[PDB]
Design a protein around this ligand. Structure first.
Ligand SMILES: CCCCCCCCCCCCCCCCCC(=O)OC[C@H](COP(=O)([O-])OCC[N+](C)(C)C)OC(=O)CCCCCCCCCCCCCCCCC
Ligand SMILES: CCCCCCCCCCCCCCCCCC(=O)OC[C@H](COP(=O)([O-])OCC[N+](C)(C)C)OC(=O)CCCCCCCCCCCCCCCCC
Ligand SMILES: CCCCCCCCCCCCCCCCCC(=O)OC[C@H](COP(=O)([O-])OCC[N+](C)(C)C)OC(=O)CCCCCCCCCCCCCCCCC
Ligand SMILES: CCCCCCCCCCCCCCCCCC(=O)OC[C@H](COP(=O)(O)OCCN)OC(=O)CCCCCCCCCCCCCCCCC
Ligand SMILES: CCCCCCCCCCCCCCCCCC(=O)OC[C@H](COP(=O)(O)OCCN)OC(=O)CCCCCCCCCCCCCCCCC
Ligand SMILES: CCCCCCCCCCCCCCCCCC(=O)OC[C@H](COP(=O)(O)OCCN)OC(=O)CCCCCCCCCCCCCCCCC
Ligand SMILES: CCCCCCCCCCCCCCCCCC(=O)OC[C@H](COP(=O)(O)OCCN)OC(=O)CCCCCCCCCCCCCCCCC
Ligand SMILES: CCCCCCCCCCCCCCCCCC(=O)OC[C@H](COP(=O)(O)OCCN)OC(=O)CCCCCCCCCCCCCCCCC
Ligand SMILES: CCCCCCCCCCC1=C(C)C(=O)C(OC)=C(OC)C1=O
Ligand code: SF4
Lengths: 80, 169, 314, 110, 70, 98, 42, 105, 156
C-alpha cells in the first residue's frame, strides 16, 4: 500500500498524477463547504421575469415592493 | 431573393446529395457529402442553431467524414455514364420541383408544401439573455440523465465492439 | 467599410507570414551560432520578397494527378481555412464577433486535415499517401486534447465567446489556474501545425511534394498562418492582456508582443530537439497527454462547484 | 452576413492565389520533358493500425461532442446531478481509453 | 549580433499590430465614436433595434437622451 | 407546410434511393447511409428550432452520436471485407447463396 | 431441387470456414549515398 | 409489450422530453405550448378511440399551430391578390408598407 | 525604346530574385560533402546569402555534385537532374566531379560529371575549401545576374 505506491510513482508518474487528480475531482466537492454556494448562486441568477402574485390579502412573506424587508435576500452573496 | 436564402441553400443541399447518391467514386462522393454537410450546416445556422451547426462541422465533417475519407484513401487504389445520367436525372427532377413550387407557391409531392420563403414561419419575440437551443443542450446534464447513461454506455460498448471485430481472433 | 476591415485583416496576415520566414531563418541562424540572411536586403529584409518572386516563376513541377480537382482544392481549402481562423480573434475586438468563436475555431481547424488527405490522394505516389495518412492521424489525434483542454479552460470562462476570455483574465492570467492545461495545450498546438519536434513530413516524404513551387508555397504560407494564429489564440487563452476600452491599442501592443514571443518560442523549440518517432508521439498523446487531460477535465468540472467559482453565462 | 462576405473574400483570395500559382509560370515556354518512389508498382498494403487510430479518434470525438455543453451545463440548478453526469462521461471516456490500452489497441502507434 | 533579428521581428510585429488597430478605428468610425454594439443574445438585439427605431435616422448608434422627451 | 422541409425530405429520399441501388462499392453505400443520417439531423434540427421545443435541442446531437458510432461499425465491417478480398466490392459478398 | 440456375452451387464447408484466398518492399534509392531495400511489415 | 417500468418504479427516464408543454429549462415555452396543453388536457384518460373524434378541434388547432398550413395558405392568397392588383394598377401600397413611416417605439 | 527598357528591368528583377534565393541540392557523394557541410557551417554560412541548407530535389535551383561520380550512380544523378524544375544549374565541386580526379583512370568512375549532366561552375580542389566552394556559388550568382532571357525573348 506504500511500496506499490512508490513503485508506480517511480515508473508511471503521469498515471499517478492522473488518478490522483481524478480522485480529488471525485471526492473533494463532497467535502467542500462552498459547494452549497454554487447552488445558491445559480438559483440567485434571474434569467426570467419575476412574475408577481395576485394579492389575495393573506401573504405575509411576499413583499409589495423590491425595497421591502420580506422576500429573498442576497446579503450572503455581497458579503461571503 | 435574399428572403429565400435558406431555401436556396437547401436546393444546393439537394444538389449535393445528387452528388454522392449517384456514387461517382467514394472520394468524390465523400467530397459531395462534405459540401452537403457545409450547406446543411448553413441551413441549421440560419434558424438559430449555432451549436448544432458547429456540431455538423466538428463532429460530422471534422470528426466522421475525416474517418470516411481516411478509410477510403486506404482502399480504392488511385489512378461513368450511369453516374452522369443519374446526376442529370436528379438535377432535372429537383429543378422541376423548384419550377412548380415557385410558379404555384404550393406543391404536393407527398405532403403539401407552401412556396413562400421559409422566413414566414418564425417567432417574433426574444429569448432574453440566453440561446434557447444552448440551454436545451445544457439540459443534457440536468434533465438528460438516462440519455447520458445509455449514450455513454453505447459509446463504451462501441469501443469494445470495434476492438473485438477488427482483431480476427 | 467592412471590406476594408477584411483586407486590413488578411493582407497583414500574408505580410506577417512573409516575414515570419525571415525571422525563423535569422533566429535559427543565431541559435546555431551562425547568422541568418543578411545579404539580400539590409539585414536580410528582402529575402522573403526575393524568395516569393523566385518561387512564383519556377517551372511548374507538372505531376500526373489521380484527381485534378482535389489537387486544385487542397491549396484552396488550406488557405481559406488558414484565413478564416483569424476572424473571431479578439485583438481586442474581433472582425466577426460571434458567440461561439472558440468552437468555430475548433471546427475550422478540424476541417484542415482534408487538405492533407486530398493532396495525399491527389498525388500518384503511394509513399506520399502513406505520409498523408500519418500526418492526418497525428493531427486528428492531437485535436482530441485540443478539444478537451479547451473545454476545461472554458469551464472558467462561462461561454464559448472569445471576447469574454479577455474579461475572464482581468485579475490574473489564466495560465496560473491552468498551467498544466497550458503546457499540454502548447505542445498539442505544436503537434497540430506539424511543427518540430513533431514534423514527420520532413523526417526520413511530405504529403504535398507533387505540388509546384507556387502551390507548395501556398501550403507553406497557410501553415505559417496557422502557426501565428494558434500562438495568438494561445495568448488570448492563457496570457490575456490588459484592456482599456478607451485605448484599444494597449491591448493590441500587449497581445502582439506576447504572440511574437510565443511564435519565437516555436522557432526556439525547433532549434533544440530531435524529432519524435511516429509511435513515440502517438505514445505521447494516447498514453500521456490524454489521461492527464481527462483527469484535469474532471478537476476543472468539479473545481468551480467546490469553490463557488462558476463563471457567468453572459 | 458579414461572415458570409468574409468567407467569400477569404475563399476568393485563396482561389486567386491558387490560380496565379498554377498559371503564372505556365506562360513560360521552358522545355518539354519526357521524364520516364520507394515502392515501384506494388499495391498499397493496408494498415489495420491507422484505421484503428482513426476509429478511436471518431469514438473519442463523439464522447467529446457529448462533453461540449459543460460550460453551459454548469449554470444549472440541479448541480449534483450535473456534476455526477459530467464526471460519469469523463470517467466513461477514461474507461474507453483504459480498455483501448489493456487490449493492446494502442500499440506500434502507442 | 543577436539584435540583427529585431528588424524582421519589428516588421512582423507591425504586421500583427495592423488588424486590431484597424478594426478598432473602423468600429469607432462606423458606430458614432464608440464601440460596436455586441449583440450575442436576442435581448441585446431587441434593445439595438429599438435604438434604431427611436433614433429616427435608421442608425442604432445615434442615441437619444432626455432631450427627446418633453 | 414550409418550403425547406420539401428539400430536406427530397434529400432523404435521394440518399435513400442511392442507398437502395448499389453500384459496386460498399463505401459509397455507407456514404449514402450517412447522407440519410445528415438529412435526418437537418430536418429534426429545423423542426426543433422552429417549434422552440427546448428539451429536444439535445435530440439531434444524440441522433448524430449513435449513428456516427454506427458509421464507425460500418467502416469496420467494410475493412474486414477489404481484408478478405482486397476490395470493398459488393459482388464479392455473395457466398451465402449456398 | 437443383435447377439449371442453381446447378453450380456446391454445398458449404463443414466448419463453415472458407479458405483465405504479403508485406511492403521499399527502394530507398540513392536520391554519404546508400541504397536500401526494405521489406517492411507495417 | 409495454412493460411500464417507469410508472412501476416511479422513476422518470424519458417522460420529460416527451411533450413540448413539459417542464423546460428557464421556463421557456414552446410556440405551441397552449395548443398542446389544451389538446392533452382534452384527450387525457378518455382513450385514443374517443380522443380522435372528441378532441378533433383542439388537435386541428394544435396541428395548424405546428405547421401553419392554413396561415401560410391565407398569406399566399392575400399576397397573390395584392400582386395581381399591383399588376393591374388598381391598388397602391400605403407608406407604412413601403418603409416610410418612422417605426413605433 | 520602351519595351527594351521594360524587359531589361524585368530581367534584372527576375535575375535578382533567382540569384538571391538559390536553393541547392547537394549530392553528398564523397569527401567534398564534408566541405560543403563546412560551407554550411557557421564560419562561412551559405544561409546568409539566401542559399538554404539541403533543399529537397524537387524544389532546388542548383545541383552541387560534391564527390566522386561512379558508374553505378550516374543514372541516379541524371534522374535527379531530370526531376529538377527549370532553371536548374549544376555546380561541379572538386576533382572527381570535374574530371575524374584521382580515380580518373578507374574502371568504375565517370570521368567528370559533365559526361552526365550539363555543368555551369567547375569548382577545383581536392577538396576545394569551403571558401572556394562559396566562391563558386557567388560566381554562379554572377552568372545568373548577367542572364538575358527576356531581352532575347523580346529580340526574337
Ligand atoms: C502556453 C505557454 C507555454 C506553456 C509551457 C510550455 C513551455 C515549455 C516547452 C518545452 C519544450 C517541449 C517540447 C516538446 C516536449 C515533448 C516531450 C514531453 O515533454 O512529453 C511530456 C512528458 C511525457 O513523459 P515521458 O514520456 O518522458 O515519460 C515516460 C512515460 N512512460 C513511463 C509512460 C514511458 O510528460 C507529460 O506527459 C506531462 C505533461 C504535463 C503534466 C503537467 C502536470 C502538472 C502537475 C499535476 C499535479 C502533480 C502532483 C500530483 C497531484 C497533487 C495534488 C495536490
Ligand atoms: C506578388 C508575388 C510575386 C509576383 C510574381 C513575380 C513578379 C514578376 C512577374 C513577372 C516576371 C517576368 C515574367 C516571368 C519570368 C520569365 C522568365 C523566363 O524564362 O522568360 C522567358 C520566357 C520565354 O522566352 P524564350 O522565347 O526565350 O523561351 C526560353 C525557352 N526556349 C528558348 C527553350 C523556348 O519569356 C516569356 O514567357 C515572356 C513572358 C512575358 C514577359 C513579361 C511581361 C510583363 C510582366 C509584368
Ligand atoms: C451508473 C449510473 C449512476 C448514476 C445514476 C444517476 C444518478 C443521479 O444523479 O440521478 C439523479 C437523476 C435526476 O434526479 P433529480 O433528483 O435531479 O430529479 C429532480 C427533477 N428534475 C430532473 C426535473 C430536476 O436521475 C434520476 O433520478 C432518474 C434517472 C436515472 C435513473 C437510474 C438509472 C440507472 C441505470 C442503470 C443501468
Ligand atoms: C477514482 C477516480 C477516477 C479514476 C478513473 C479516472 C482516471 C483519469 C485518468 C484516465 C486514465 C486512463 C487510462 C488508464 C489506464 C490504466 C492501466 C494501465 O495503463 O496499465 C498499464 C500500466 C503499465 O504500463 P505499460 O502497459 O507497461 O505501458 C508502457 C508504459 N510503461 O500500469 C500502470 O501504470 C499501473 C496503473 C494503475 C496504478 C495507478 C495508481 C495511481 C494512484 C494515485 C493515488 C490514488 C488516487 C485515487 C484513485 C484510485 C487509484 C487506484
Ligand atoms: C508594414 C511594413 C511592411 C514593410 C515591408 C518591407 C520591409 C523592407 C523594406 C525595404 C528595406 C530597404 C530596401 C532597399 C532596396 C535596395 C535599394 C538599392 O540600393 O538598390 C540598388 C539597385 C541598383 O542601384 P544602382 O543605381 O544601380 O547602384 C549604383 C550606384 N552607383 O537599385 C534597384 O534595385 C532599384 C530600386 C529598387 C528599390 C526597392 C525597394 C524595396 C521594396 C520594398 C517593398 C515594400 C515597401 C514597404 C511596403 C509597406 C509600407 C507602404
Ligand atoms: C517601368 C519600369 C519598371 C518595369 C517593371 C519593374 C518593376 C520594379 C521591379 C524592381 C526594380 C527593378 C530593378 C531590380 C533590381 C536591379 C538592380 C540590382 O539587381 O541591384 C543589385 C543590388 C544588390 O547587389 P548584388 O548584385 O546583390 O550584390 C551582392 C552584394 N555584394 O540589389 C539590391 O540592392 C536589391 C534589389 C531589390 C529589387 C527590388 C525589390 C524587390 C521587388 C519588389 C517589387 C515586386 C515584389 C513585391 C512583393 C512580392 C511579394 C513578397
Ligand atoms: C470544397 C468546398 C470549398 C472549400 C473552401 C471553403 C469552405 C471551407 C471554409 C469556410 C467554412 C465556412 C463556415 C461557415 C459557417 C461557420 C459557422 C458559423 O456561422 O459560426 C458563426 C456564428 C455562430 O455564432 P453566433 O454568434 O452564435 O451566431 C450569430 C448570432 N448573433 O454564426 C453566424 O455568424 C451565422 C451567420 C449566417 C450563416 C452563415 C452561413 C454560411 C454559408 C453556408 C456554409 C458555407 C460553407 C459550405 C461548404 C463547407 C465546406 C465544404
Ligand atoms: C423509381 C425509383 C428510382 C427513381 C430515380 C431513378 C434515377 C435514375 C436511375 C435509374 C437506373 C439506372 C441504372 O442503371 O442504375 C443502376 C445503378 C447501379 O448499377 P451499376 O452497376 O452502376 O450499373 C449497371 C447498370 N444497371 O444504380 C444507380 O447508380 C442508382 C443511383 C440512384 C441515386 C439517386 C439519385 C437521385 C435520383 C432522382 C431522385 C430519386
Ligand atoms: C502570396 C504569396 C506571399 C509570399 C510567399 C510566402 C512568403 C515567402 C516564403 C518563402 C519560403 C521560404 C523562406 C522557405 O524557406 C521555404 O522553404 C521551407 C519555403 O517553402 C517552399 C518558402 O515558401
Ligand atoms: S575532389 Fe577529392 S576530396 Fe573531393 S570528393 Fe574527390 S577525392 Fe574526395
Amino acid at each position: 500500500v506504500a511500496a506499490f505506491l512508490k513503485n508506480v510513482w517511480a515508473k508511471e508518474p503521469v498515471l499517478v498524477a492522473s488518478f490522483a487528480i481524478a480522485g480529488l475531482a471525485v471526492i473533494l466537492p463532497t467535502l467542500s463547504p462552498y459547494t452549497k454556494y454554487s447552488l445558491m448562486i445559480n438559483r440567485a441568477t434571474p434569467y426570467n421575469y419575476p412574475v408577481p402574485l395576485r394579492d389575495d390579502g393573506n401573504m405575509p412573506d411576499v413583499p409589495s415592493h423590491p425595497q421591502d424587508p420580506q422576500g429573498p435576500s442576497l446579503e450572503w452573496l455581497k458579503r461571503l | 431573393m435574399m428572403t429565400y436564402i435558406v431555401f436556396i441553400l437547401s436546393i444546393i443541399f439537394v444538389m449535393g446529395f445528387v452528388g454522392f447518391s449517384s456514387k461517382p467514386s467514394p472520394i468524390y462522393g465523400g467530397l459531395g457529402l462534405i459540401v452537403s454537410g457545409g450547406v446543411g450546416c448553413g441551413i441549421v445556422l440560419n434558424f438559430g442553431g449555432s451549436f448544432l451547426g458547429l456540431m455538423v462541422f466538428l463532429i460530422y465533417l471534422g470528426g466522421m467524414m475525416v474517418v470516411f475519407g481516411y478509410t477510403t484513401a486506404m482502399a480504392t487504389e488511385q489512378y461513368n455514364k450511369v453516374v452522369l445520367g443519374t446526376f442529370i436525372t436528379g438535377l432535372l427532377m429537383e429543378f422541376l420541383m423548384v419550377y412548380y413550387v415557385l410558379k404555384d407557391k404550393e406543391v404536393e409531392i407527398v405532403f403539401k408544401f407552401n412556396g413562400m420563403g421559409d422566413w414566414v414561419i418564425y417567432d417574433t419575440g426574444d429569448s432574453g439573455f440566453f440561446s434557447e437551443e444552448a440551454m436545451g443542450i445544457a439540459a443534457l446534464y440536468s434533465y438528460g440523465t438516462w440519455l447520458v447513461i445509455v449514450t455513454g454506455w453505447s459509446l463504451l460498448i462501441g469501443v469494445v465492439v470495434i476492438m473485438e471485430i477488427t482483431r480476427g481472433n | 467599410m467592412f471590406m476594408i476591415n477584411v483586407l486590413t485583416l488578411i493582407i497583414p496576415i500574408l505580410l506577417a507570414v512573409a516575414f515570419l520566414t525571415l525571422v525563423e531563418r535569422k533566429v535559427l541562424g543565431y541559435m546555431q551560432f551562425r547568422k541568418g540572411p543578411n545579404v539580400v536586403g539590409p539585414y536580410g529584409l528582402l529575402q522573403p520578397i526575393a524568395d516569393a518572386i523566385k518561387l512564383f516563376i519556377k517551372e511548374p513541377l507538372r505531376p500526373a494527378t489521380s484527381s485534378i480537382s482535389m489537387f486544385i482544392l487542397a491549396p484552396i481549402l488550406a488557405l481559406t481555412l488558414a484565413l478564416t481562423m483569424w476572424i473571431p480573434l479578439p485583438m481586442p475586438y474581433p472582425l466577426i464577433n460571434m458567440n461561439l468563436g472558440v468552437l468555430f475555431m475548433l471546427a475550422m481547424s478540424s476541417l484542415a486535415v482534408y487538405s492533407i488527405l486530398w493532396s495525399g490522394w491527389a498525388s500518384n505516389s503511394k509513399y506520399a499517401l502513406i505520409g498523408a495518412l500519418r500526418a492526418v492521424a497525428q493531427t486528428i489525434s492531437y485535436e482530441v486534447t485540443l478539444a478537451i483542454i479547451l473545454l476545461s479552460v472554458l469551464l472558467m470562462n462561462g461561454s464559448f465567446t472569445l471576447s469574454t476570455l479577455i474579461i475572464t483574465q482581468e485579475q490574473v492570467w489564466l495560465i496560473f489556474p491552468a498551467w498544466p492545461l497550458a503546457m499540454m495545450w502548447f505542445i498539442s498546438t505544436l503537434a497540430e501545425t506539424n511543427r518540430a519536434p513533431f514534423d514527420l513530413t520532413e523526417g526520413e516524404s511530405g504529403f504535398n511534394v507533387e505540388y509546384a513551387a507556387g502551390p507548395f508555397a501556398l501550403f507553406f504560407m497557410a501553415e505559417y498562418a496557422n502557426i501565428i494564429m494558434m500562438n495568438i489564440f494561445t495568448t488570448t487563452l492563457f496570457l490575456g492582456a490588459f484592456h482599456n476600452p478607451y485605448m484599444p491599442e494597449l491591448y493590441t501592443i500587449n497581445f502582439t508582443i506576447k504572440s511574437l514571443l510565443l511564435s519565437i518560442t516555436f522557432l526556439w523549440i525547433r532549434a533544440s530537439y530531435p524529432r519524435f518517432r511516429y509511435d513515440q508521439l502517438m505514445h505521447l498523446l494516447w498514453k500521456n497527454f490524454l489521461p492527464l487531460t481527462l483527469a484535469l477535465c474532471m478537476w476543472h468540472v468539479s473545481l468551480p462547484i467546490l469553490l463557488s467559482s462558476i463563471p457567468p453565462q453572459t | 452576413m458579414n461572415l458570409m462576405i468574409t468567407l467569400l473574400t477569404n475563399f476568393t483570395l485563396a482561389t486567386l492565389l491558387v490560380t496565379i500559382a498554377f498559371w503564372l509560370p505556365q506562360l513560360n515556354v521552358y522545355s518539354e520533358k519526357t521524364s520516364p518512389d520507394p515502392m515501384g508498382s506494388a499495391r498499397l498494403p493496408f494498415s489495420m493500425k491507422f484505421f484503428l487510430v482513426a476509429i478511436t479518434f471518431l469514438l473519442f470525438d463523439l464522447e467529446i461532442a457529448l462533453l461540449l455543453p459543460l460550460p453551459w451545463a454548469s449554470q444549472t440548478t440541479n448541480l449534483n446531478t450535473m456534476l455526477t453526469m459530467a464526471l460519469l462521461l469523463i470517467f466513461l471516456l477514461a474507461v474507453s481509453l483504459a480498455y483501448e490500452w489493456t487490449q493492446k489497441g494502442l500499440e506500434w502507434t502507442e | 549580433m543577436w539584435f540583427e533579428v529585431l528588424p524582421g521581428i519589428a516588421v512582423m510585429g507591425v504586421c500583427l499590430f495592423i488588424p486590431g488597430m484597424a478594426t478598432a478605428r473602423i468600429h469607432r468610425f462606423s458606430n458614432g465614436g464608440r464601440e460596436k454594439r455586441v449583440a450575442h443574445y436576442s435581448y441585446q438585439w431587441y434593445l439595438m433595434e429599438r435604438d434604431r427605431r427611436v433614433s429616427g435616422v435608421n442608425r442604432y448608434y445615434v442615441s437619444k437622451g432626455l432631450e427627446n422627451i418633453d | 407546410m414550409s418550403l425547406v422541409y420539401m428539400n430536406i425530405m427530397m434529400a432523404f429520399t435521394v440518399s435513400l434511393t442511392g442507398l437502395l441501388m448499389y453500384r459496386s462499392h460498399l463505401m459509397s453505400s455507407l456514404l449514402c447511409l450517412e447522407g440519410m443520417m445528415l438529412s435526418l439531423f437537418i430536418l429534426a434540427t429545423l423542426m426543433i428550432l422552429n417549434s422552440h421545443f427546448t428539451l429536444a435541442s439535445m435530440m439531434p446531437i444524440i441522433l448524430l452520436v449513435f449513428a456516427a458510432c454506427e458509421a464507425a461499425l460500418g467502416l469496420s465491417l467494410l475493412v474486414m471485407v477489404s481484408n478478405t478480398y482486397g476490395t470493398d466490392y459488393v459482388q464479392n459478398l455473395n457466398l451465402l447463396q449456398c | 431441387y437443383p435447377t439449371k440456375e442453381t446447378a453450380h452451387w456446391k454445398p458449404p464447408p463443414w466448419n463453415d470456414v472458407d479458405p483465405p484466398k504479403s508485406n511492403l518492399t521499399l527502394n530507398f534509392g540513392p536520391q554519404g549515398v546508400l541504397r536500401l531495400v526494405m521489406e517492411l511489415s507495417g | 409489450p409495454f412493460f411500464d417500468v417507469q410508472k412501476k418504479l416511479g422513476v422518470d427516464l424519458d417522460h420529460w422530453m416527451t411533450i413540448q408543454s413539459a417542464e423546460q429549462p428557464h421556463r421557456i415555452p414552446a410556440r405551441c405550448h397552449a395548443f398542446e396543453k389544451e389538446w392533452i388536457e382534452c384527450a387525457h384518460g378518455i382513450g385514443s378511440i374517443r380522443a380522435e373524434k372528441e378532441c378533433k378541434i383542439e388537435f386541428e388547432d394544435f396541428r395548424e399551430c405546428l405547421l401553419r398550413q392554413k396561415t401560410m395558405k391565407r398569406l399566399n392568397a392575400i399576397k397573390r391578390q395584392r400582386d395581381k392588383l399591383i399588376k393591374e394598377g388598381k391598388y397602391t401600397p400605403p407608406p407604412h408598407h413601403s418603409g416610410q413611416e418612422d417605426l413605433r417605439p | 525604346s520602351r519595351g527594351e527598357y521594360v524587359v531589361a528591368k524585368l530581367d534584372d528583377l527576375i535575375n535578382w530574385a533567382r540569384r538571391s534565393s538559390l536553393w541547392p541540392m547537394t549530392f553528398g557523394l564523397a569527401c567534398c560533402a564534408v566541405e560543403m557541410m563546412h560551407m554550411a557551417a557557421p564560419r562561412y554560412d551559405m544561409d546568409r546569402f539566401g542559399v538554404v541548407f539541403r533543399a529537397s530535389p524537387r524544389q532546388s535551383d542548383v545541383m552541387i555534385v560534391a564527390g566522386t561520380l561512379t558508374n553505378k550512380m550516374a543514372p541516379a544523378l541524371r534522374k535527379v537532374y531530370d526531376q529538377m524544375p527549370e532553371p536548374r544549374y549544376v555546380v561541379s565541386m572538386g576533382s572527381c566531379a570535374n574530371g575524374g580526379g584521382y580515380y580518373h583512370y578507374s574502371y568504375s568512375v565517370v570521368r567528370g560529371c559533365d559526361r552526365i549532366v550539363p555543368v555551369d561552375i567547375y569548382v577545383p580542389g581536392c577538396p576545394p575549401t569551403a571558401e572556394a566552394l562559396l566562391y563558386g556559388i557567388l560566381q554562379l550568382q554572377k552568372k545568373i545576374k548577367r542572364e538575358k532571357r527576356l531581352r532575347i525573348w523580346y529580340r526574337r
